[PDB]
Design an enzyme around this catalytic site. Sequence first.
Site, PDB file in Angstrom:
ATOM      1  N   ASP A  35       0.993  -1.277  -0.164  1.00 20.13           N
ATOM      2  CA  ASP A  35       0.026  -0.050  -0.144  1.00 20.13           C
ATOM      3  C   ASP A  35       0.636   1.305  -0.278  1.00 20.13           C
ATOM      4  OD1 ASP A  35      -1.799   1.846   0.786  1.00 20.13           O
ATOM      5  OD2 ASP A  35      -2.631   0.944   2.372  1.00 20.13           O
ATOM      6  N   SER A 199      -0.505  15.565 -12.023  1.00 18.43           N
ATOM      7  CA  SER A 199      -0.643  15.184 -13.295  1.00 18.43           C
ATOM      8  C   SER A 199      -1.300  16.686 -14.178  1.00 18.43           C
ATOM      9  CB  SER A 199      -2.618  14.640 -13.668  1.00 18.43           C
ATOM     10  OG  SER A 199      -2.502  13.512 -15.225  1.00 18.43           O
TER      11      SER A 199
HETATM   12  O1  46J Z   1      -6.542   5.769   3.995  1.00 18.71           O
HETATM   13  C1  46J Z   1      -6.331   5.435   2.109  1.00 18.71           C
HETATM   14  C2  46J Z   1      -5.960   4.982   2.205  1.00 18.71           C
HETATM   15  C3  46J Z   1      -7.125   3.881   2.071  1.00 18.71           C
HETATM   16  C4  46J Z   1      -6.628   2.730   0.766  1.00 18.71           C
HETATM   17  C5  46J Z   1      -5.418   2.113   0.533  1.00 18.71           C
HETATM   18  N1  46J Z   1      -4.549   3.201   0.914  1.00 18.71           N
HETATM   19  C6  46J Z   1      -4.364   4.492   1.780  1.00 18.71           C
HETATM   20  N2  46J Z   1      -5.764   7.276   2.219  1.00 18.71           N
HETATM   21  C7  46J Z   1      -5.376   7.832   1.250  1.00 18.71           C
HETATM   22  C8  46J Z   1      -6.316   8.519   0.726  1.00 18.71           C
HETATM   23  C9  46J Z   1      -6.362   9.786   1.445  1.00 18.71           C
HETATM   24  C10 46J Z   1      -7.059   9.537   2.878  1.00 18.71           C
HETATM   25  C11 46J Z   1      -6.056   8.297   2.942  1.00 18.71           C
END
Ligand code: 46J
Length: 330
Positions: A35, A199
């Site tokens: 992630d 982008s």
């Molecule tokens: O919690 C997340 C994501 C969830 C899915 C997995 N990646 C992290 N964030 C990224 C987008 C803004 C809020 C925080």
Amino acid sequence: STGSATTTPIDSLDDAYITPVQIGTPAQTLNLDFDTGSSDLWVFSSETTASEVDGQTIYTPSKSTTAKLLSGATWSISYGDGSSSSGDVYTDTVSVGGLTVTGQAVESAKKVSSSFTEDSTIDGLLGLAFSTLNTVSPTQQKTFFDNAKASLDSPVFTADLGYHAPGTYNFGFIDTTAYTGSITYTAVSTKQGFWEWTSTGYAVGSGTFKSTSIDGIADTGTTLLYLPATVVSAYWAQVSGAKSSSSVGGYVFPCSATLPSFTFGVGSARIVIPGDYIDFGPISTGSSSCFGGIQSSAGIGINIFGDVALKAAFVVFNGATTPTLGFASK
Ligand SMILES: O=C([C@@H]1CCCNC1)N1CCCCC1
Ligand SMILES: O=C([C@H]1CCCNC1)N1CCCCC1
């Protein structure tokens, strides 16, 4: 050093990808969701509330000769989809694709929310955003990549996600056989702890390219592509019968449709997401309404280049002193 591991979709929709990770001695292999949008490496474990485990492989630190309690450390994380997990922390040896980090913080879940319990194929997360987002208290911990960085041949990792197919995460080198043409690099802001970039615009199908700055994050842990409402409306306006449904929770379209491609800009370069990548199938089993893979970011507070976008590219996460992101077609 380098590492190279295959990443595999968890289901027929590419809802997420799992990568095998070796933890402890002797190795315990868990399948983790890599992630780039978070910074905690956490796992289902022997400490996880029993009723919250449903088919996951667990890490058992008492069976690892290299595990050590990180005394007093706790963690708790809440993700943007409303899911969450929390627990305590061990240090142990963690290897990915042949690349080994000793003393890695492995966050052992005591509690996980229902969406984690319900996904039997995901044994935890391995965060690859910047360590400033790590939730361990009172001593913040480093990501696997940050710990590995100094030992790597080059301070980079790459994501090469497949469409309905396996792909690859590489650490420490750029596989020049894995992409076509050249890699276009673009600036990153680490101010919010993410791989945040801008982008240069978009096109819908065979339409003209619209030059416009779209700030967002490269997030392998988010399934879909979340963009400003203006952009998303322009996309779905090209699909007969598509509409935003508050009851379903986003744009849906007739399953009989042929979806147009979506192009996004990276500097003067262009990455084309084929229409098929934007199809997330029936909203419920047997429905003729299908869920869209491009959705509005309004209310999230940030645009997200999730898997729908990233899997169309070979993506370089450059963790040099001034980080950058590279995109190539493939
Ligand atoms: O919690 C997340 C994501 C969830 C899915 C997995 N990646 C992290 N964030 C990224 C987008 C803004 C809020 C925080
Ligand atoms: O699941 C969601 C949101 C999108 C719909 C509104 N509430 C949930 N997201 C995926 C994870 C990153 C943030 C966006």
